[PDB]
Amino acid sequence: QGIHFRRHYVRHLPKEVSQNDIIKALASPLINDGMVVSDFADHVITREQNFPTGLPVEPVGVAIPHTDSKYVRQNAISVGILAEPVNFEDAGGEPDPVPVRVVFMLALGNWFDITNVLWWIKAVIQDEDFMQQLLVMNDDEIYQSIYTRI
Template sequence: MALLDRNLIHRNVTFSDSDNALKMMAEAMVAQHFVKPSFVEAVINREHQFPTGLPTGGITVAIPHADWTNVHKGTISVATLKNPVAFKNMGDPDETLNVRLIFMLAVDEPHAEVKLLQDLMGIVQNQAALQGLLDAKDDDSLYNRLESMFRDVTVGTGKKESSK
């Protein structure tokens, strides 16, 4: 099972606000049949109740997600933003963060989210890796960098992906 799909990687994009970003990314997941149409509203509603902006020490990220019942097949959508978008801070919802990278998660099993978030935390704490994603010169370069980062990350299969 491939975690990443080229149709869900968005490089150097512009969104008007966080809701627009979530809607556009989630709708791409629906179009590729990874998630149910209910995922779009679910991920936006969840973000309003439980913000996912994460101050990582430089390049700020958001990790939006919705309940596994809205997911057909686990995946991650990634967007590098041309201009930062305001997301509320996960740890302090009264604080607004200027997010440059969005990692939208779709997990297809209950409890798989915790494991995926743990794996993702190791990635987002690496500022050099995050900068490398923002600096990708073309879509292929961004995809290849992400593929390398996520090679051993799974979204609900319970097994590590083998390197190919």
């Protein structure tokens, strides 16, 4: 419970959305609940543009957008499933963009929670049955199976 993960923190996104669109769509539940500052998204964007968070993993591309922890009010996590792949720049400096389709936006300010959530993300994104299921499932199912791992 060190982290707030609500039901409306899980949502699907249409094909006509850009990188900023994803960030804004995912940050707003965090904003409404007052989990982060009210211009969280602008910060996340600027942080992504300098330190890209695209992860080249098979078979479902992941990105994990965040910002400085000094913008978080309480720990929270917002998930987004893309209908079509959207390009995130690769977190490792590789020329080729990650075809992201699952996005874990992190609004964490507690260090001991940050490390734990990252370790978890690393574990989950190497489970191809899980990652693939996240596409076909609905919000609740997604919420359910992710919560079952928290």
